């Protein structure tokens, strides 16, 4: 049962790539419409959805339309999907990035981070339509694989 | 919006996640997929090739909690390696080769991902959002893996 405000997903507010009409459903039940033109989204929604009031658009498995978010480069943390059902948590310090969490020990991730629009989530905001459930993040005494080498959790990504 | 001929080529195979998928084919048809045990039951009008072929066209109008889990035994795939750039990968046995790219000097990861990370596999789109694919350049262009450069047609180095 969707409930106003308490059920609401934290939506995206920012630059969009592509123009047209976006459509989504907030977990509260609200249908949110985004009118996108020149990188900017105008939000239409009901009074009962936190997204309507914040001017945000909750991206999820029920999002449709031609546009995609282009997230701001000043993010702190991101969820990066590195295998079919596995995630690494990326922490951005300056221009450097660190794997600070993972869903399973010895998860293999690419040696460099992609552009932020390839992240599943940035600072708690979902960016992708399909995304597997994130398992609880392991942040202690775990390692990740890059090729043949093992790196300790908190390590910088090999290529930087 | 012409029946059969406007139609997008759709996916048929294993899905992960069970539940109800919905999409709109470019012909205008609404197609529903009921996913149970990784298998999809199609419901659609007889005016769409996807109904007639048992397939499900994944695009910007797809909704539902499931995703394709394609067999690792494709021949060619489209791989989105930058915001608006793609590489074409050709598989031969356990080896992969970059056989096309949308711009010269594209950088790509050294390893191909699992197939569900491809935007297209053998002409079947797998991803909901996907930027338009510019013409694929298949000759006299280079791709980069880290600091190393390779001519089109070359194997990906982490193999
Ligand atoms: Zn809501
Ligand atoms: Zn059709």
Curated annotation (Swiss-Prot), chain A:
It is a peripheral membrane protein. Cleaved by host caspases which are probably activated by the viral infection. Residues 132-136 are annotated as: Interaction with non-structural protein 4A. Residues 2-160 are annotated as: RNA-binding. Changing residue 155 to A: No effect on replication. Zn(2+) 2 binds at residues 8, 26, 28, 49. It is found in: Host endoplasmic reticulum membrane; Host cytoplasm, Host perinuclear region; Host mitochondrion; Host cytoplasm. Monomer. Homodimer; dimerization is required for RNA-binding. Interacts with the mature core protein. Interacts with host GRB2. Interacts with host BIN1. Interacts with host PIK3R1. Interacts with host SRCAP. Interacts with host FKBP8. Interacts with host VAPB. Interacts with host EIF2AK2/PKR; this interaction leads to disruption of EIF2AK2 dimerization by NS5A and probably allows the virus to evade the innate immune response. Phosphorylated protein that is indispensable for viral replication and assembly. Both hypo- and hyperphosphorylated states are required for the viral life cycle. The hyperphosphorylated form of NS5A is an inhibitor of viral replication. Involved in RNA-binding and especially in binding to the viral genome. Zinc is essential for RNA-binding. Participates in the viral particle production as a result of its interaction with the viral mature core protein. Its interaction with host VAPB may target the viral replication complex to vesicles. Down-regulates viral IRES translation initiation. Cell culture adaptation of the virus leads to mutations in NS5A, reducing its inhibitory effect on replication. The N-terminus of NS5A acts as membrane anchor. The central part of NS5A contains a variable region called interferon sensitivity determining region (ISDR) and seems to be intrinsically disordered and interacts with NS5B and host EIF2AK2. The C-terminus of NS5A contains a variable region called variable region 3 (V3). ISDR and V3 may be involved in sensitivity and/or resistance to IFN-alpha therapy. The C-terminus contains a nuclear localization signal. The SH3-binding domain is involved in the interaction with host BIN1, GRB2 and Src-family kinases. This is Non-structural protein 5A. It comes from Hepatitis C virus genotype 1b (isolate Con1). The chain holds residues 2005 to 2163 of 3010 of the full protein.
């Amino acid at each position: 049962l969707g409930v106003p405000f308490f059920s609401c997903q934290r939506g995206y507010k920012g630059v969009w790539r592509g123009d047209g009409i976006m459509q989504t459903t907030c977990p509260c039940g609200a249908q949110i419409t985004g009118h996108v033109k020149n990188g900017s989204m105008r939000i239409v929604g009901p009074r009962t959805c936190s997204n309507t009031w914040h001017g945000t658009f909750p991206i999820n498995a029920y999002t449709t339309g031609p546009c995609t978010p282009s997230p701001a480069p000043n993010y702190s943390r991101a969820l990066w999907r590195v295998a079919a059902e596995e995630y690494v948590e990326v922490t951005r310090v300056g221009d450097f990035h660190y794997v600070t969490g993972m869903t399973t020990d010895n998860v293999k991730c690419p040696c460099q981070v992609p552009a932020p629009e390839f992240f599943t989530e940035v600072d708690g905001v979902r960016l992708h339509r399909y995304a597997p459930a994130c398992k609880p993040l392991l942040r202690e005494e775990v390692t990740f694989l890059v090729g043949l080498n093992q790196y300790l959790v908190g390590s910088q990504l090999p290529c930087e």
